[PDB]
Design a protein around this ligand. Structure first.
Ligand SMILES: OC[C@H]1O[C@@H](O[C@H]2[C@H](O)[C@@H](O)[C@H](O)O[C@@H]2CO)[C@H](O)[C@@H](O)[C@H]1O
Length: 138
């Protein structure tokens, strides 16, 4: 496997038609997963499944600028399950990140950080065994 937290460099940043594919398995009794698309210290797109927030499962998405979190976008559709293998696909489209899990569309996140080619790293963290993380141009 890959060691978590795992960094995936995105050479030259992201660009529309770039597809990121993450395969892993959720640990037993998981609490959280996070994807952090970084522009230096800023987080352009934070994607954060939470398995127990006040006894609810929710995906929280946000942007961090100068160490400040912005407005959360929350999604109560929650395709992850403790103990089970998953696939996350993040497709960069011109105006949003488009996320599908296990081949089903999940959410979109409008670009707040505009300098896409400066979003040069993806951090993958949380309560998972990470099997693979890669990108391709489609
Ligand atoms: O917004 C993403 C960001 O959330 C932090 O937790 C928030 C929490 O979601 C919010 O309900 C509460 O009022 O403030 C917390 C701190 O901003 C996480 O700590 C952080 O990791 C991100 O997930």
């Amino acid at each position: 496997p890959l060691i978590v937290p795992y960094n995936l460099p995105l050479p030259g940043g992201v660009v529309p038609r770039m597809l990121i594919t993450i395969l892993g398995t959720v640990k037993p009794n998981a609490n959280r997963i996070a994807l952090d698309f970084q522009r230096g210290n800023d987080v352009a797109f934070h994607f954060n499944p939470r398995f127990n927030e006040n006894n609810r499962r929710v995906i929280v998405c946000n942007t961090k600028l100068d160490n400040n979190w912005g407005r959360e976008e929350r999604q109560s559709v929650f395709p992850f399950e403790s103990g089970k293998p998953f696939k996350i696909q993040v497709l960069v489209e011109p105006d949003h990140f488009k996320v599908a899990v296990n081949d089903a569309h999940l959410l979109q996140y409008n670009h707040r950080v505009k300098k896409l080619n400066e979003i040069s790293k993806l951090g993958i963290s949380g309560d998972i065994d990470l099997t693979s993380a890669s990108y391709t141009m489609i």
